[PDB]
Scaffold this active site. Structure first.
Site, PDB file in Angstrom:
ATOM      1  N   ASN A   1      76.650  29.183  15.477  1.00 14.71           N
ATOM      2  CA  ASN A   1      75.487  29.815  16.077  1.00 14.71           C
ATOM      3  C   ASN A   1      75.945  30.387  17.389  1.00 14.71           C
ATOM      4  OD1 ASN A   1      73.116  30.538  17.384  1.00 14.71           O
ATOM      5  ND2 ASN A   1      72.297  28.503  17.330  1.00 14.71           N
TER       6      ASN A   1
ATOM      7  N   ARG B   1      74.506  31.425  11.681  1.00 19.68           N
ATOM      8  CA  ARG B   1      73.107  31.623  12.016  1.00 19.68           C
ATOM      9  C   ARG B   1      72.918  32.992  12.528  1.00 19.68           C
ATOM     10  NH1 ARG B   1      68.567  27.674  14.628  1.00 19.68           N
ATOM     11  NH2 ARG B   1      67.220  29.298  15.558  1.00 19.68           N
TER      12      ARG B   1
ATOM     13  N   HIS C   1      62.420  30.764  13.571  1.00 25.46           N
ATOM     14  CA  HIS C   1      62.540  29.388  13.112  1.00 25.46           C
ATOM     15  C   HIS C   1      62.488  29.324  11.594  1.00 25.46           C
ATOM     16  CE1 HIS C   1      60.616  28.405  17.186  1.00 25.46           C
ATOM     17  NE2 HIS C   1      61.911  28.141  17.262  1.00 25.46           N
TER      18      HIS C   1
ATOM     19  N   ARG D   1      58.128  30.572  27.897  1.00 27.62           N
ATOM     20  CA  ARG D   1      57.507  31.772  27.381  1.00 27.62           C
ATOM     21  C   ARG D   1      56.021  31.669  27.375  1.00 27.62           C
ATOM     22  NH1 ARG D   1      61.311  31.619  22.490  1.00 27.62           N
ATOM     23  NH2 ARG D   1      63.057  32.916  23.181  1.00 27.62           N
TER      24      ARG D   1
ATOM     25  N   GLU E   1      68.783  22.478  10.987  1.00 27.53           N
ATOM     26  CA  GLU E   1      69.088  23.846  10.647  1.00 27.53           C
ATOM     27  C   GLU E   1      70.534  23.949  10.132  1.00 27.53           C
ATOM     28  OE1 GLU E   1      66.931  23.908  14.135  1.00 27.53           O
ATOM     29  OE2 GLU E   1      66.316  26.039  13.897  1.00 27.53           O
TER      30      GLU E   1
HETATM   31  N1  LIG Z   1      61.545  12.167  24.105  1.00 21.98           N
HETATM   32  C1  LIG Z   1      60.906  13.340  24.313  1.00 21.98           C
HETATM   33  N2  LIG Z   1      59.575  13.435  24.634  1.00 21.98           N
HETATM   34  C2  LIG Z   1      58.985  14.629  24.818  1.00 21.98           C
HETATM   35  N3  LIG Z   1      59.689  15.792  24.678  1.00 21.98           N
HETATM   36  C3  LIG Z   1      61.006  15.810  24.366  1.00 21.98           C
HETATM   37  C4  LIG Z   1      61.707  14.571  24.136  1.00 21.98           C
HETATM   38  N4  LIG Z   1      62.997  14.873  23.843  1.00 21.98           N
HETATM   39  C5  LIG Z   1      63.137  16.205  23.890  1.00 21.98           C
HETATM   40  N5  LIG Z   1      61.926  16.734  24.151  1.00 21.98           N
HETATM   41  C6  LIG Z   1      61.634  18.132  24.348  1.00 21.98           C
HETATM   42  O1  LIG Z   1      62.091  19.081  23.393  1.00 21.98           O
HETATM   43  C7  LIG Z   1      62.246  20.311  24.097  1.00 21.98           C
HETATM   44  C8  LIG Z   1      63.597  20.753  23.600  1.00 21.98           C
HETATM   45  O2  LIG Z   1      63.461  20.867  22.213  1.00 21.98           O
HETATM   46  P1  LIG Z   1      64.607  21.553  21.317  1.00 21.98           P
HETATM   47  O3  LIG Z   1      65.899  20.726  21.302  1.00 21.98           O
HETATM   48  O4  LIG Z   1      64.628  22.972  21.794  1.00 21.98           O
HETATM   49  O5  LIG Z   1      64.002  21.562  19.816  1.00 21.98           O
HETATM   50  P2  LIG Z   1      64.586  22.716  18.847  1.00 21.98           P
HETATM   51  O6  LIG Z   1      64.693  22.011  17.486  1.00 21.98           O
HETATM   52  O7  LIG Z   1      65.913  23.067  19.531  1.00 21.98           O
HETATM   53  N6  LIG Z   1      63.684  24.275  18.914  1.00 21.98           N
HETATM   54  P3  LIG Z   1      64.383  25.694  19.703  1.00 21.98           P
HETATM   55  O8  LIG Z   1      64.395  25.173  21.115  1.00 21.98           O
HETATM   56  O9  LIG Z   1      63.700  27.045  19.712  1.00 21.98           O
HETATM   57  O10 LIG Z   1      65.677  25.865  18.963  1.00 21.98           O
HETATM   58  C9  LIG Z   1      62.109  19.976  25.616  1.00 21.98           C
HETATM   59  O11 LIG Z   1      60.766  20.035  26.150  1.00 21.98           O
HETATM   60  C10 LIG Z   1      62.354  18.505  25.629  1.00 21.98           C
HETATM   61  O12 LIG Z   1      61.736  17.857  26.753  1.00 21.98           O
END
Ligand SMILES: Nc1ncnc2c1ncn2[C@@H]1O[C@H](COP(=O)(O)OP(=O)(O)NP(=O)(O)O)[C@@H](O)[C@H]1O
Ligand SMILES: Nc1ncnc2c1ncn2[C@@H]1O[C@H](COP(=O)(O)OP(=O)(O)NP(=O)(O)O)[C@@H](O)[C@H]1O
Lengths: 391, 391
Positions: free
Chosen positions: A8, A80, A169, A230, A375
């Site tokens: 990716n 990706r 997504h 965003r 993913e």
């Molecule tokens: N234990 C937790 N409680 C609340 N939020 C959390 C926790 N762990 C991670 N997050 C939140 O998840 C977000 C990051 O998510 P992420 O890793 O981006 O999911 P993703 O599957 O990567 N979607 P995308 O970000 O577009 O690729 C941040 O707000 C983090 O604070």
């Protein structure tokens, strides 16, 4: 022990995982990052690259696998791809044609296309006798009907410029929806799911009989849900009013809406939900507002996406936030009492170590669940299926 | 036989009705229009004004009532005001203070504010010993909570510039929701309604226990539903992409989104739903698409607004389109099978001569109804209630 290498290759980074073909387990992961002082960081060695282009970072990654005697086990490479326009409706074996077709999408997401194509060019150099696969974040959503993908702009913007909802997504929504038919014991061909992929990027998707029929992001990732940084849905009138009032240009505002808004923009504090949950717990009013707003826009889009279903069987949470935020999931679900949801709070309290898990209580009209997204595994599965083909 | 004179004094027109105070029936209506060759058109005399300012058109209207010996029966004047910001939460007796406060809203809708204030100045000249009332299109929506009114923009845009969702059609949504508690025999204090005001301008509103808790238009009338000529919700990313690609400015695009989009923009034919329904009937594919798209975005917003309710008791259609389009109502309702709606098609076929009418069949989980809207009557009722007050 053949492996798949999954890449990716974004505007600042190259994330990669190496997955065993037998189990789809991760054997190695990492990230070349900062792409003036670039560096390679395998889960260990936080090693430095500096002034490295995409081919350099990947040659570095290739040498780390050569290091670990993996090179000859690499049977497949999965890339990706951010954006496939209307040209890609499923994952493909990469050939010159596929490269030409990815390039034609460039104008729709110019820097991110460029990076994904840079990663393809690099990998094709580093692994010429290895089949490579392209998996597109948009392609699952290509089953949307025109009533669901068109904007209310003049027809010319759609027919000449390809302005229309794409959605993103897709690879997560698809993976999670497949796991949902098993977890919930639903017949795929007769089913209605809403998937909420809540991460730093966030989107909803309605899956009717195994196909995506609505999704919340738009032509770009800026539409729909409010996210980390965003804005999500924002009145264009309000945006044009702001321009006139502050003298900012579309380009100014675009940066604002992509990089300074959302949880960050309301809270004044952070995009990170954990920081905000703790701030609220300490009396911070704006953090609470950022969260309540976040939650309200999730509930709104969930119910709205449901309208594309003939029957709502399940709501499934996924992503960093959907998987880990006990409080966000419960607030969302309590905001959807109108659909007959009933939360089992003890089940909702379980941490993400518990994996694929039902969180609604028995009397619930709709099953609610948490399904960790993966993913890389989805991409590898596509690659492995494509590995059986004669090209 | 006292009467109320109701004025809606917009950028090109002054619409007026004279309503009897006893029955709230219309005794006379009309429109001064084209405000280089302006003209006055009482339902009869299509008479010419030419080069007429707002005070002129209204002096003309006053002389027509002097004509018909109405002048001395005018006990109240009700002014429709487009925008009341956060300053107005209910209809008010107009005083210098109210005028000052309406003027402070000017920046939020500059030409339309100016016109409404021009009509106030004119009427205050023409009827100095008559109590005058201001009724605001935004004020019903002032019960929205912050999670429902905030955009995901930086907090500064809200706290310094007043960027937030206002919503419109408030006076229609309010009137229709009051009629709904009677038609559906619902307890106002324990109730959930969605009102779809479908006209050339269109919006949804969720009314929970008699108060507006969500609505689809935004800071301006451009947000939400796709409409006759307005785009409705549109990805700001897509709008910024279009700018870069065509070299148009925000101001260019704003005109496009307000005046060339929507039903007109997709169909390439008309904003008028009757023309489009007939075009589709004749095989016109783009008209069918314009309609299906229109319908899809209505269903989506209806279900989404439902998320702000604890219980959905009713969905109520109103406006030119909601009142008269048999096909639009049925397509919307069939798009909401997920909420348990069941249409009685024979009831849905009845023309608008049948007035306030239930259109769902008995097995329906939610009552669906058509309630003709009557903003003039609502304004007059407010005026009459306010006529009992000591100022
Ligand atoms: N234990 C937790 N409680 C609340 N939020 C959390 C926790 N762990 C991670 N997050 C939140 O998840 C977000 C990051 O998510 P992420 O890793 O981006 O999911 P993703 O599957 O990567 N979607 P995308 O970000 O577009 O690729 C941040 O707000 C983090 O604070
Ligand atoms: N018989 C009909 N069938 C279908 N659509 C109709 C019919 N009659 C009127 N309309 C539509 O109603 C729209 C005009 O509605 P309108 O009079 O604007 O309602 P409204 O109450 O004025 N809302 P707003 O326009 O914002 O003030 C046009 O599309 C008309 O075609």
């Amino acid at each position: 022990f053949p492996v798949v290498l999954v890449i990716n290759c974004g505007s600042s980074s190259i994330k990669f995982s190496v997955l065993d073909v037998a189990t789809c387990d991760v054997l190695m992961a990492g990230i070349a990052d900062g792409m003036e002082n670039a560096f390679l960081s395998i889960n260990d060695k936080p090693i430095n690259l500096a002034h490295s282009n995409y081919e350099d970072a990947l040659k570095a990654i290739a040498f780390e696998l050569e290091k670990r005697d993996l090179t000859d086990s690499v049977a497949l490479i999965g890339h990706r791809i951010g954006h496939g326009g209307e040209l890609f409706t499923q994952s493909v074996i990469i050939t010159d044609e596929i490269i030409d077709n990815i390039r034609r999408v460039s104008p729709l997401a110019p820097l991110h296309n460029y990076a994904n194509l840079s990663g393809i060019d690099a990998a094709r150099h580093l692994f010429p006798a290895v089949r490579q696969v392209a998996v597109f974040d948009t392609s699952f959503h290509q089953t949307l009907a025109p009533e669901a993908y068109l904007y209310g702009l003049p027809w010319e913007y759609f027919s000449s410029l390809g302005v229309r909802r794409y959605g993103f997504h897709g690879t997560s929504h698809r993976y999670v929806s497949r796991r949902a038919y098993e977890l919930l014991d639903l017949d795929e061909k007769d089913s209605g799911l809403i998937v909420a992929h809540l991460g730093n990027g966030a989107s909803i998707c309605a899956v009717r009989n195994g196909q995506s029929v609505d999704t919340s992001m738009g032509m770009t990732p800026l539409e729909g849900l409010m996210m980390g940084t965003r804005s999500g849905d924002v009145d264009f009138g309000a945006m044009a009013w702001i321009a006139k009032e502050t003298g900012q240009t579309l380009s100014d505002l675009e940066r604002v809406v992509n990089k300074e808004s959302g949880l960050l923009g309301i809270s004044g504090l952070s995009s990170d939900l954990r920081v905000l949950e703790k701030a609220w717990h300490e009396g911070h009013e704006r953090a609470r507002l950022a969260i309540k707003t976040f939650v309200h826009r999730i509930a709104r889009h969930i119910a709205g996406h449901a309208a594309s279903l003939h029957r709502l069987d399940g709501i499934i949470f996924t992503g960093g936030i959907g998987e880990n935020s006990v409080l966000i999931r419960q607030l969302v679900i309590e905001h959807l009492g109108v659909l007959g949801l009933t939360l089992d709070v003890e089940m909702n309290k379980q941490p993400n170590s518990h994996g694929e898990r039902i969180i609604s209580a028995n009397p619930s009209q709709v099953i609610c669940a948490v399904i960790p997204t993966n993913e890389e595994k989805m991409i590898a599965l596509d690659a492995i299926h494509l590995g059986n083909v004669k090209a």
